[PDB]
Design a protein around this ligand. Sequence first.
Ligand SMILES: CN1CCN(c2nc3ccccc3s2)CC1
Ligand SMILES: CN1CCN(c2nc3ccccc3s2)CC1
Ligand SMILES: CN1CCN(c2nc3ccccc3s2)CC1
Ligand SMILES: CN1CCN(c2nc3ccccc3s2)CC1
Ligand SMILES: [Zn+2]
Ligand SMILES: [Zn+2]
Ligand SMILES: [Zn+2]
Ligand SMILES: [Zn+2]
Lengths: 360, 360
Amino acid sequence: MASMERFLSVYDEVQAFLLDQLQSKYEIDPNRARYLRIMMDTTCLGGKYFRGMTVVNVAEGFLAVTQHDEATKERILHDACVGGWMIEFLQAHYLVEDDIMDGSVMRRGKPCWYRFPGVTTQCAINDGIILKSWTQIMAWHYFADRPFLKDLLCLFQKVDYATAVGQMYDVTSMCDSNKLDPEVAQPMTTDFAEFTPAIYKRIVKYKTTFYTYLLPLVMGLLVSEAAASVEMNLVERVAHLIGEYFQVQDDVMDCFTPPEQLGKVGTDIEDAKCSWLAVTFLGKANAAQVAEFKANYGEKDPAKVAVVKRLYSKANLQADFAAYEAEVVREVESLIEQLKVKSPTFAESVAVVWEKTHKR
Amino acid sequence: MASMERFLSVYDEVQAFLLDQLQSKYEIDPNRARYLRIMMDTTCLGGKYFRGMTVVNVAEGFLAVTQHDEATKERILHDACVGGWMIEFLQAHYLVEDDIMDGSVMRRGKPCWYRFPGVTTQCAINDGIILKSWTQIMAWHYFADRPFLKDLLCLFQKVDYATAVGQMYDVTSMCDSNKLDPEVAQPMTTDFAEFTPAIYKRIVKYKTTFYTYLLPLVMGLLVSEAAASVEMNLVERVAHLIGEYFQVQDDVMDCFTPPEQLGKVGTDIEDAKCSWLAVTFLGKANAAQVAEFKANYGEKDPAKVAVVKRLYSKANLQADFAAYEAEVVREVESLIEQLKVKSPTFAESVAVVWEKTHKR
Ligand SMILES: CN1CCN(c2nc3ccccc3s2)CC1
Ligand SMILES: CN1CCN(c2nc3ccccc3s2)CC1
Ligand SMILES: CN1CCN(c2nc3ccccc3s2)CC1
Ligand SMILES: CN1CCN(c2nc3ccccc3s2)CC1
Ligand SMILES: [Zn+2]
Ligand SMILES: [Zn+2]
Ligand SMILES: [Zn+2]
Ligand SMILES: [Zn+2]
């Protein structure tokens, strides 16, 4: 059975379990069950399932080199699929809430969930809460007897917390740290002294890399009972590295990829986000360019945004990106080599993860 | 050491742990640590701590009848305090998000957290996410070696899920179930056919009773390793019963308690909530009264709200409340008697919980 075919089949099974449980144990009525079914499909489906499929792919790699009864192979693949859906539903939670938090309009060519006419923000915040609650329902049901349940739940929590801390770093990245204060309305930075590579890397590490790369890789190891085949410090280093490159690509696409391709109108400039483009531009601009950036960044005015986009183009950030990518390619390959020491199979899975990231 | 004194001391210890961990493991800077410290204090402190103290009180009851070394008594009391704070932080999460969802203005005489000038909804949604994440950080840290960790985490999840499902029932309680549809903007019911005692009881059971009564009582049993001293079906029945009475009191106060005493301006009428007052009024109104209620309920117009308040007063719902309370007093006492069969100590703790609920 092909990997994606199995993964999608498990979605239907998990969805049926969750909705049937809501009827048998939570007194749900059929119309609310239908609401939640539509909410699940709308928020969890339609992507490429890269995070969930990484769990499956890691587990398949170990299956090829480990002796098991057929029923055990099937159990491991089913576990990897459920775990992959835990990650996809966790991402769904983040995307629903982030879209509300940022006042976003579109995601993947369709309206953000909170903007659907019969949803609204009042329901959508709670729908997002439910999406994350469903990840825990999945784990306690499907993994109740598994030796890895404890380690999996502990990992999932730590990843979730790191991601929420990362969201805090992201939403406050255009403030001056010394001015943060619940009592005082927050002005945008004027000096941009905190738009540095180290601060950018901290934002991205926490807001993206734990749930997009560390979680799927480690969950694949856990459902495979293979965490001893790897040096965990190496898995963390390579996950944070690939994850940062993934976010840098996203940052570049927000500015330069056409809306129809992006599936949304990017507003990192109007939102004054600490993007890779802003940080890298400031790391090479002269005094006049810095001043013109300061006069235009973080404003909704289309003329001011266009000015920022000119400044980026004229700064030849394409060359900086090729240099960054060359260094990431160098460093990921080095970490993969270190991973072959204890597991050529896992190192090959990481290699596949990197190719899928690098090509898109 | 007095119970409340110990409970508050543990707050400072937990807060110090969480913030110190954010510095040592999450790369936090001192200004964001201060933001989160203020957010924690503002959202978690200032109430009566009834839920958290119930854990402590249940554990103290067992301590009085169970042989332990002194260090073990101290460990149990510390565990009960941490568990109580897990519940208070979970409530803090719900209140932050509910206030955003409902567009609330005040809570306990102070602005809702999202309305603080340097917070805003963009930060406050995530602050609420962090509050719940902190409950899991607490459990995995303080209870890492405890035999009850698994049972406690599983219970906490189920309670959280039931509460989120309850919030869905609450926010959709003024819609017609057959009309729910993400694609279509939701009109308020016109027939109010779903304002029934059974439907009201389902809302309250899920939205309030699991986290306010079932969770503190069962957590007290868990940290005491005393779940065998009770019939769990009885604990559930008494928790749901007391919890419903608690919410009925809240519903009555929303309408009739002065704002300065309530700590907010109640808007259940303008919000068209399925309150105990609306359900009970419809369960005794004549045809003309039903019509006048339909013409006025769920509108912000102060004259229409006053009309609804007149209809309630003229309907003598005070008599219905005294009848409801008399029946609850009857039924709680019956369940306490059944609880004495296996544990007079736990039955006495439940009795204390009921008195604290009944008097306020
Ligand atoms: C690729 N982006 C990574 C950061 N994302 C987050 N959204 C939330 C929402 C709530 C809590 C944490 C996070 S992190 C948005 C998508
Ligand atoms: C006609 N436009 C020319 C410039 N655009 C850019 N692509 C990148 C990629 C990486 C970093 C910066 C840029 S700017 C593409 C479309
Ligand atoms: C006494 N009320 C019980 C119901 N409350 C809830 N708020 C939320 C928020 C998010 C998820 C679930 C719930 S339940 C508000 C206070
Ligand atoms: C001057 N007002 C008289 C009526 N108010 C009510 N108190 C309750 C309590 C339980 C049920 C209904 C009502 S109406 C108190 C203040
Ligand atoms: Zn965002
Ligand atoms: Zn982006
Ligand atoms: Zn509410
Ligand atoms: Zn209320």
